[PDB]
């Protein structure tokens, strides 16, 4: 769905502020203030390859960066989707205690 | 003079925020 019908590669680029509190970064200094993360989806290739300041990396590096930015995708608090909205709709006190 | 877009200076923006997003071939 993301890939344009006909085009081989679909590209998203996202730029964030950088601070000297996150490790395992490529090409980017701690004093630098720019983190550029690029995701490309193509039909022919089936692998998890991301880009950090336009440098190819495995998804593990970007995942551990996301972990070190105190932001989480699986957790429902940081990200809310339709299924997650439905799950919050019928929410028990035990789930509140768990969170 | 020639029109210049606002400078995406990340220092002014709060840490962890996003200034410019590029969407290609969607």
């Amino acid at each position: 769905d993301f890939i344009k019908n006909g085009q081989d590669v679909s590209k998203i680029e996202i730029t964030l502020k950088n601070s000297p509190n996150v490790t395992d970064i490529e090409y980017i200094d701690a004093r630098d203030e720019t983190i550029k993360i690029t995701r490309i989806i193509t039909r022919s290739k089936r692998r998890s390859d991301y880009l950090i300041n336009d440098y190819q990396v495995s998804e593990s590096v970007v995942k551990t960066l996301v972990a070190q930015l105190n932001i989480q995708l699986d957790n429902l608090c940081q990200f809310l989707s339709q299924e997650r909205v439905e799950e919050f709709a019928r929410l028990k006190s035990v789930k509140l205690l768990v969170e | 003079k020639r029109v210049k877009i606002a400078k995406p200076d990340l220092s002014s923006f709060q840490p962890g925020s996003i200034i410019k997003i590029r969407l290609q071939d969607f």
Binding site: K11, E13, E26, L51, D54, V61 | -
Partner: protein, 142 residues
């Protein structure tokens, strides 16, 4: 509850502020219902054969590989052949292109080219062999 909170209140709203005051009786009560490499410089190159060995420590080779390790993730590292016919260690510039796919095109270009893995670069016999001729070898990074 010790100070005159009325005398100040009496001075205000009367001497100053000229504010109209009205009782406004309860008239509506009675409503009628109406019914990372900043310091380094690129151009220098040297053999790698004692770039790895340090009389002090064996792990010196690993930190030499650590220089490659920062470049392993994207794979930009490529060392060029000298007279011996094998790649030679040298420093790499920071490189940048226009868009995120342009550099990607760059990396798969280098993968397409011939790769320098015919012989593992660090091997025991030749390092001693070069020591005997000119005693140069030596590391450029430490």
């Amino acid at each position: 509850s010790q100070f005159n909170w009325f005398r100040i209140g009496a001075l205000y709203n009367t001497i100053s502020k000229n504010a109209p005051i009205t009782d406004h009786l309860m008239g509506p009560l009675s409503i009628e219902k109406k019914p990372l490499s900043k310091k380094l410089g690129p151009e220098g190159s040297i053999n790698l054969f004692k770039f790895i060995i340090d009389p002090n420590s064996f792990s010196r080779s690993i930190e030499n590989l650590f220089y490659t390790s920062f470049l392993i993730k994207e794979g930009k590292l490529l060392m060029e052949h000298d007279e011996e016919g094998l790649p030679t260690i040298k420093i790499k510039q920071s490189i940048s292109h226009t868009d995120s796919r342009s550099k990607e095109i760059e990396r798969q270009r280098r993968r397409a080219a011939h790769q320098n893995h015919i012989i593992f670069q660090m091997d025991m016999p030749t390092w001693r062999k070069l020591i005997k001729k000119y005693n140069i070898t030596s590391p450029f990074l430490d």
